[PDB]
Structures are given as C-alpha cells and as structure tokens.
Amino acid sequence: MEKLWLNSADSHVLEPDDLWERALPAALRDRAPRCVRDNGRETVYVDGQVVRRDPLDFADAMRPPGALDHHIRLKDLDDQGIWGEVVFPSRGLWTAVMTDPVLARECIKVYNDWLKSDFLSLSPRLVGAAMVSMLDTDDAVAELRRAADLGYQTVFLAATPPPGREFNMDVWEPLWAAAEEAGMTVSIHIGTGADTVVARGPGGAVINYVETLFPAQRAVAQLVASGALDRHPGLRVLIAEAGCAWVPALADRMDEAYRQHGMFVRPKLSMLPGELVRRQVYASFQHDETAIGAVTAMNYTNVLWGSDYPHLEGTFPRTQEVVTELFAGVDPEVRDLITRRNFTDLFTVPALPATV
C-alpha cells in the first residue's frame, strides 16, 4: 500500500515552544517568536508586534504527532512511502519579517544549531534548510559558511525579501558566490517575508492562495534577469511550494522580453532566460497534474514532488493515493525524474535501489 517510493522536496518541522527562550542572550529572549493560547486563539508575537491570530482548530490541524515528535515523523515517512525529505521551518520563518538584523542573526543561529543537533541527527533521510539573514549579506554569508561546515546542503530564503533587498540587487552577489562555492542549493519557499492576507472579499481563500505565487515568479525573474544565475553556473535554486507549470510559461515570457525588447535589456546574458531557467531553476508541487505536462511537453525537467507535510495543502496522509493517481499511465522515466532523481541531484541522502 506504499509501493511507490518518493523523495519529498518540501515539508516543515514545528520548533520546540521554548527553542529561543533557553538559547538566546537575555537581552533578546523576549523579542523572539512566542505564542499565547487563550480563548479559541493562538496569537504569535515577534519583537513587539502581533504577526498572527488563529483559532486553535486550524493551528492544531497542521500539528499531527509527527509534526512535533521526530521519531513518529520517521514512521510517517515510512507509512507514506517517502524516503528522503527536505525540512523547512515553521516559527523560524518569522525571522524573515524581523527588522532588527541582530535579533534575526541570533534567532537564525539558534534555529540552525537545534535543527542539526536535535533533528537532522535522527536519520540521514532528513535534509534540513539552514536559515540565513534576509537583512544583512555579511550575516547571511557567515551563517551559510558555518551551516555548510556543519554539513547543511541548502539555505532557506524568504520569497519576499525586505524592501531594497530585491533578488536582482548587487547586495546579494556575495551570497550567490558563497552558495556556489559551497555547493549549497538556494531554497526559496513561498508565503514567507511579508503578508499574503491581502484579499478580503468573495473568494479570499482561493485569491490569497494565488497571491503567494507572485513573489515566487518575481524572484525567478529577478535571479534570471539580473545575471545572478548566469554569473553562477553552479548555483541551483529551488522554488518550494509554488507549483511548476508557471516556470516554463515565465521562461517564455522572459525570452520574449529579452529578444523583442533587447535594446532596453541590461545586463546582457550569456544565454537566454529560458536556458538559465531550464539549467538552474527547480520547482516543487504536491497535487498539480500540470507538473507532468511541464516535463513532457514544455521541456522543463526540473520538477520535484513534495508532500508539504503537515500542511492542509500537502498530501498527508493520502501520499500513496495522490501519487499513484498522478502517475497512472505516465512514463516511468518521468515518474522517476519527478519523484526521485531531481531530489538526488540537489540533495544527498542514502541511495535506494533505483527500480526503473
């Protein structure tokens, strides 16, 4: 009943409630992410601001026992037929909306040290994303370098960077250089860095779920148009949890501007935007049938599957039912590429016997 073995390019780890309470310098402790559970309500506070209010029902729906207990997580991976799994933050993501570079740097060190010592230590099937400062390039380079010396394979960046720190700016060049030198995949996860509760009228739930795409597409356009990827041929970028089929559409959109608006284009690129996307830009999805069409009809081979465990928008606990229906009638080479091989190009886990 779990016959199709998968690697998951997207999932999340819930941090211990006291992670920052115990480990931060006393001056910083009270400003770290912290939650109050009262009335029906969880309220999350970050550095003197309420950043989140939810009824406990929804909050706790994304908190099955594996989302917390790493021993149960590994058993859920077996149960769902997932071998290797990339693990992103939950509360740690709020470091991306902080305005104080020192609070962000120190909260990121704590998170990165806990994830490696207390979680990535349980199984080599776990590939964690180290956070790096969104606010200061020297802080982000130093932590990437420390995280890599510790055996991290990828860094997390928020899809919406702080104002004036868009991904086409010169300020990021030292980070691209260090990531390329380290062999570090840059993982950009959507729904991070900002607020995505922008739509309030009829259809808000569906409209807001679409709005979170825009920073993902913008990030790809900035990395491609700025020459960041062109200048760093070894630099690979994963766009996590934005789906896949918009990526070749965007490759075509950029090619059209590059070719028809060339007289306004700076910098020039050594190859077309679409060639950079197809070489270096990867994208994950959970349910999207269109991800298979991207590979088979749009020559976009950089599609990875993800469970996004334990989010509502992920596959858990119906991983096998989802993927078996997704890949019914599909070339096994394509199913292998999307569910296993793109994962192992990016990330190192112990190799299974590759059944076709």
Query: What residues make contact with Mn ion under the rule CB under 5 A?
Result: 10, 38, 241, 260, 308, 311, 313
**Closest CB to a second copy among residues 5, 214:** 214
Letter for the amino acid at 135? L
Does 29 interact with a second copy (rule: CB under 8 A)?
Answer: no
Q: Which of 100, 118, 138, 289 binds a second copy (CB under 8 A)?
A: 289
> How far, in Å, CA of 257 to CA of 287, rounded?
31
User: CB under 8 A: which stretch of 14-22, 24-32, 259-267, 339-347 binds a second copy?
Assistant: 259-267
Which does residue 328 bind out of a second copy, Mn ion, none, counting CB within 5 to 8 angstroms by kind?
Answer: none
Out of 134, 237, 240, 251, name the contact with a second copy by CB under 8 A: 251
CA-angle at 324, arms to 322 and 325, nearest 5°: 65
Q: Find the binder of a second copy among 1, 26, 312, 356 (CB under 8 A).
A: 312
Nearest to 111 by CA among 22, 47, 10, 238: 22
Cis status of the peptide bond prior to 161, with omega within 30 of 0: no
Whether residue 241 is annotated as binding a ligand: the answer is yes
Residues 142-201 binding a second copy (CB under 8 A) are 166, 168-170, 197, 199, 201
Determine whether the annotation assigns residue 260 to a binding site: yes
Kindly identify the residues of this chain, within the stretch 268-287, that bind a second copy according to CB under 8 A.
273, 285-287
Structural tokens at position 250: 């965007």
- Looking only at the bridges linking them, the beta strands covering 41-45 and 34-38 are antiparallel
Residue 36 interacting with a second copy (CB under 8 A): no
Backbone angles phi, psi at 163, to 5 degrees: -55, 135
Q: Which is nearer to a second copy, 37 or 71 (CB)?
A: 37
CA 39 to chain centre: 32
Stretch that binds a second copy, among 75-83, 137-145, 174-182, 253-261 (CB under 8 A): 253-261
Nearer to a second copy, 187 or 196 (CB): 196
Using alpha carbons, list the distances in angstroms from residue 295 to 249, 292, 300, 301: 12, 5, 5, 5
Contacts of 292 (CB under 8 A, 6+ apart): 303, 326, 327, 330, 334, 338
Task: Spell 93-123 as b/e; 16+ CB within 10 A means b.
Answer: bbbbbbeebbbbbbbbbbbbbbbbeebbeeb
Residue 168 interacting entry, from a second copy, Mn ion, none, C-beta within 5 to 8 Å by type: a second copy
**Which of 353, 327, 329, 347 has its CA nearest to residue 339?**
327
For residue 57, state whether it binds a second copy (rule: CB under 8 A).
yes
Consult the annotation and say whether 312 binds a ligand.
Answer: yes
Residue type for 109, please?
Answer: K
Among 64, 101, 293, 317, binds a second copy (CB under 8 A): 293
10 or 47: whose CB is closer to Mn ion? 10
- x/- track of binding to a second copy for residues 213-232 (CB under 8 A): xx--xx--xx-xxxx-----
Q: Coil, helix or strand for 187?
A: strand
**Which residues sit in the known binding site?**
10, 12, 38, 189, 241, 260, 308, 311-314
**Which residues sit in the known binding site for Mn(2+)?**
10, 12, 38, 189, 241, 260, 308, 311-314
